[PDB]
Design an enzyme around this catalytic site. Structure first.
Site, PDB file in Angstrom:
ATOM      1  N   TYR A  32     -10.192   7.230  -1.656  1.00  0.00           N
ATOM      2  CA  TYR A  32     -11.258   7.577  -2.583  1.00  0.00           C
ATOM      3  C   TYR A  32     -11.489   9.055  -2.766  1.00  0.00           C
ATOM      4  CZ  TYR A  32     -12.378   2.631  -2.965  1.00  0.00           C
ATOM      5  OH  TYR A  32     -12.331   1.255  -3.238  1.00  0.00           O
ATOM      6  N   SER A  52     -10.250   7.743   2.570  1.00  0.00           N
ATOM      7  CA  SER A  52      -9.337   8.849   2.251  1.00  0.00           C
ATOM      8  C   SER A  52      -8.735   8.645   0.860  1.00  0.00           C
ATOM      9  CB  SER A  52      -8.247   8.983   3.337  1.00  0.00           C
ATOM     10  OG  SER A  52      -7.374   7.861   3.298  1.00  0.00           O
ATOM     11  N   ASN A 103     -13.502   2.765   7.706  1.00  0.00           N
ATOM     12  CA  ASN A 103     -12.307   2.483   6.928  1.00  0.00           C
ATOM     13  C   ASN A 103     -11.671   3.749   6.370  1.00  0.00           C
ATOM     14  OD1 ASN A 103     -10.276   1.601   5.302  1.00  0.00           O
ATOM     15  ND2 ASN A 103     -11.611   0.502   3.885  1.00  0.00           N
ATOM     16  N   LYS A 124       0.980   3.946  -4.725  1.00  0.00           N
ATOM     17  CA  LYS A 124       0.174   4.302  -5.906  1.00  0.00           C
ATOM     18  C   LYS A 124      -0.201   3.128  -6.786  1.00  0.00           C
ATOM     19  CE  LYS A 124       2.064   8.888  -5.625  1.00  0.00           C
ATOM     20  NZ  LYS A 124       0.927   9.065  -4.676  1.00  0.00           N
ATOM     21  N   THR A 180       0.812  -1.192   0.000  1.00  0.00           N
ATOM     22  CA  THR A 180       0.000   0.000   0.000  1.00  0.00           C
ATOM     23  C   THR A 180       0.861   1.263   0.000  1.00  0.00           C
ATOM     24  OG1 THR A 180      -0.257   0.021   2.424  1.00  0.00           O
ATOM     25  CG2 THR A 180      -1.978  -1.124   1.096  1.00  0.00           C
ATOM     26  N   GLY A 218      -2.742   1.144  -6.067  1.00  0.00           N
ATOM     27  CA  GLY A 218      -4.189   1.206  -6.109  1.00  0.00           C
ATOM     28  C   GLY A 218      -4.706   2.301  -7.013  1.00  0.00           C
TER      29      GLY A 218
END
Ligand SMILES: CC(C)(COP(=O)(O)OP(=O)(O)OC[C@H]1O[C@@H](n2cnc3c(N)ncnc32)[C@H](O)[C@@H]1OP(=O)(O)O)[C@@H](O)C(=O)NCCC(=O)NCCSSCCO
Ligand code: NI
Length: 159
Positions: free
Chosen positions: A138, A136, A131, A102, A99, A104
């Site tokens: 999103y 954040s 969550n 970048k 995670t 995701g």
């Protein structure tokens, strides 16, 4: 590191489940019990259901199912469900150690590019309100809260 994005295929099935399981346990540590998660993974992320979703994606039907592969090893995935000209982002999970690099964002942008090619101009998603990691991520990628449903926020992004 070399990170590749492509459609999952049935051969990815087992690493897929292991990534889902590891991401879930980390993501929902504050939120659900160890057993609830293990039950959810065994009921929802069953071999049979994931396989059917992987195939529907392969056949360019109502699912899009992509993976992020680091030197040939699946470390994350995104899954979308298309109904009409609207997409729902069902799942986006990375192995916890991958995670904040970048990957995701990259999964999301590729999904977006495929959707825009199909003429789909709206994406909605369900994110648990506690969550903060996902939530954040999103809003930092243009999603806006439009509603709530139970424990979740319903967020939307238009193109
Ligand atoms: C949510 C996931 C998929 C985001 O992917 P990335 O980790 O690659 O995010 P980046 O593009 O690098 O963006 C960085 C911002 O994302 C948040 N973030 C990311 N990692 C974090 C860790 N480890 N701790 C805390 N926050 C983190 C931050 O907001 C960050 O911005 P800055 O801090 O730099 O300002 C990925 O993290 C993931 O897989 N998370 C766990 C699963 C999850 O929450 N999934 C999505 C919700 S469930 S599924 C689809 C239906 O909603
Ligand atoms: Ni950060």
């Amino acid at each position: 590191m070399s990170i590749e994005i492509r459609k999952l295929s049935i051969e990815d099935l087992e690493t897929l489940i292991e990534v889902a399981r590891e991401s879930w346990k980390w993501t929902y540590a504050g939120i659900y019990s160890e057993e609830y998660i293990e039950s959810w993974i065994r009921e929802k992320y069953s071999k049979e259901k994931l396989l059917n979703e992987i195939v529907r994606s392969q056949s360019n039907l109502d699912i899009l199912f992509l993976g992020a592969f680091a030197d040939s090893t699946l470390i994350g995935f995104i899954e979308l469900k298309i109904i009409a000209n609207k997409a729902e982002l069902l799942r986006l999970y990375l192995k916890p150690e991958y995670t904040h690099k970048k990957i995701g964002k990259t999964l999301l942008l590729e999904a977006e590019k495929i959707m825009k090619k199909k003429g789909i101009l709206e994406c909605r998603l369900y994110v648990h309100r506690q969550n903060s990691v996902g939530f954040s991520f999103y809003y930092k990628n243009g999603f806006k809260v439009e509603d709530t449903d139970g424990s979740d926020f319903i967020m939307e992004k238009k193109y």
